[PDB]
């Protein structure tokens, strides 16, 4: 039985299970460290100050952020080792410099000569040191330099003392759904940075840090012994996309939207809830996988899965659950409450300015999301 207070806040609202959060976090930390590396957790799934305390051993422990809004918030909270892992816009260099002048080791990411020259020009004009990763393309999906591209050498040389190392994200691993496919994708990700690192060293370039990761590759890679750090973030809570990939099952999913039944359609056997896309997002990641959960798997207020029930459709402020003939409208009266598991934790969390947290001791906490850019 969930605590009585789940029924207190008006719906819809986001609910994080602290006990499951902590389990998910402990599992990956122990796994990566047993494989000879360490984590640089990514803060962008949850984007709360509290999440960094669960994920990081100390204020100086390496972390990843997806925005300078995050960087500024975590720096204010005392965190001093932050990789801003999105290709840098030159106009943001003054904000990066401002953090570095406050004692924050704020690293940036780039993959082109224009960005590298902007860093060098800024450094020259303002006397500012930078710490810079070059993005490597490991999965043919996003940015980064291919390991064999001669411009890898040119760009690293241009950066000189500001060059810190190599970073890749194999987000393409999300297409996988077998253990061997995942192991292979993790090896592809690591090999891309190994090859890039070898090409750098052959050319006389020192590479202080090699950095790989996504939740799937972090959970299935077999050898991180020569990789400096592994990054992951969505594993904090998991989601249905992860369930379908096979990184977790339903029991590991620590995020849900608490929703109230606000109507019925007797003719069509529908429940209408207050969980529209404004609460869930329109992420439909599971539609491209082998089990389509619509806009989320429906659960009881105690968290247990209601077989066969999903939020099939949404508008802005309501959702529709098409009941199967195994269910009766009468058992879900207006005012009854449910929990919806998300397709994509990162996308659903973006919709909530404040999260409610079921602490492992049964108590109720709230966390404020760091929003904007």
Residue nearest to Zn ion (CB): 346
d(CA 284, CA 342): 9
CB contact at 8 A, 261 and 338: yes
Q: State how far the alpha carbon of 6 is from the alpha carbons of 1, 252, 288, 289, 316, in Å.
A: 10, 19, 33, 32, 23
Chosen residue from 8, 76, 206, 300 binding Cl ion by CB under 5 A: 300
Instruction: For residue 344, say whether it is annotated as part of any ligand binding site.
Output: yes
Applying CB under 8 A, the site for its own copies has a residue count of 55
Subset of residues 329 to 358 that bind Zn ion, contact rule: CB under 5 A: 346
Q: Pairing relation of β-strands 337-341 and 13-17?
A: unpaired
Instruction: For residue 176, say whether it is annotated as part of any ligand binding site.
Output: no
CB contact at 8 A, 188 and 216: no
Q: For the packed helices 151-159 and 179-202, what is the interaxial angle rounded to 10 degrees?
A: 60
Shortest Å, Cβ 320 to its own copies = 8
CB contact at 8 A, 257 and 277: no
Q: For the window 218-237, what string marks contact with Zn ion as x by the rule CB under 5 A?
A: ----------------x---
- DSSP, collapsed to helix, strand or coil, labels residue 186 as helix
CB contact at 8 A, 242 and 50: no
Q: Does 94 bind Cl ion (CB under 5 A)?
A: no
Q: Does 301 bind its own copies (CB under 8 A)?
A: no
Applying CB under 5 A, the site for Cl ion has a residue count of 12
Positions that interact with Cl ion (CB under 5 A): 2, 112-113, 176, 178, 181, 282-284, 300, 303, 315
Positions that interact with its own copies (CB under 8 A): 10-13, 44, 66-68, 86-92, 95, 111-112, 114-115, 118, 142-143, 171, 260, 262-265, 272, 274, 277-279, 281-284, 315-318, 320, 333-335, 346-347, 350-351, 353-354, 371-373
Positions that interact with Zn ion (CB under 5 A): 234, 346
């Amino acid at each position: 039985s969930a605590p009585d207070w789940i029924a207190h806040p008006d719906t819809p609202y986001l609910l994080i299970d602290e006990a499951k959060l902590k389990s998910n976090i402990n599992y990956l930390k122990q796994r990566v460290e047993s494989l000879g590396s360490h984590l640089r957790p990514h803060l962008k799934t949850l984007r709360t100050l509290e999440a960094a305390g669960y994920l990081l051993d100390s204020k100086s422990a390496p972390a990843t952020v997806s925005t300078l809004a995050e960087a500024e918030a975590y720096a204010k909270a005392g965190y001093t080792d932050l990789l801003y892992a999105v290709g840098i816009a030159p106009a943001k260099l003054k904000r990066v410099a401002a953090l570095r002048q406050q004692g924050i080791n704020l690293h940036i990411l780039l993959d082109n000569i224009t960005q590298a020259q902007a860093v060098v020009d800024y450094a020259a004009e303002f006397g500012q040191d930078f710490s810079v990763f070059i993005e490597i393309d490991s999965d043919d999906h996003r940015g980064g330099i291919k390991p064999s591209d001669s411009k890898l050498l040119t760009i690293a040389k241009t950066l000189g003392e500001h060059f810190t190392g190599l970073m890749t994200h194999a987000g393409g691993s999300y297409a996988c759904n077998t253990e061997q496919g995942l192991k292979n994708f993790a090896k592809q990700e690591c090999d891309a940075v190994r090859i890039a690192r070898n090409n750098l060293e052959t050319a006389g370039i020192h590479c202080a840090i090699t950095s790989v990761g996504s939740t799937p590759t972090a959970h299935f890679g077999e050898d991180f012994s020569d990789i400096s750090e592994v990054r992951a973030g969505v594993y904090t809570t998991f989601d249905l996309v992860m369930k379908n990939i096979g990184v977790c099952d339903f029991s590991h999913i620590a995020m849900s939207v608490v929703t109230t039944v606000i109507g019925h359609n007797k003719e069509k056997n529908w429940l209408l809830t207050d969980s529209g896309w404004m609460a869930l997002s329109r992420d439909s990641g599971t539609a491209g996988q082998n089990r389509d959960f619509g806009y989320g798997q429906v659960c009881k207020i105690d968290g247990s899965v209601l077989d066969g029930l999903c939020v099939n459709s949404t508008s802005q402020e309501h959702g529709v659950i098409e009941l199967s003939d195994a269910y009766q409208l009468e058992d879900f009266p207006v005012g009854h409450q449910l929990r919806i598991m998300p397709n994509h934790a990162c996308a659903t969390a973006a919709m909530h300015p404040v999260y409610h947290v079921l602490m492992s001791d049964g108590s109720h906490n709230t966390w404020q999301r760091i929003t904007g850019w």
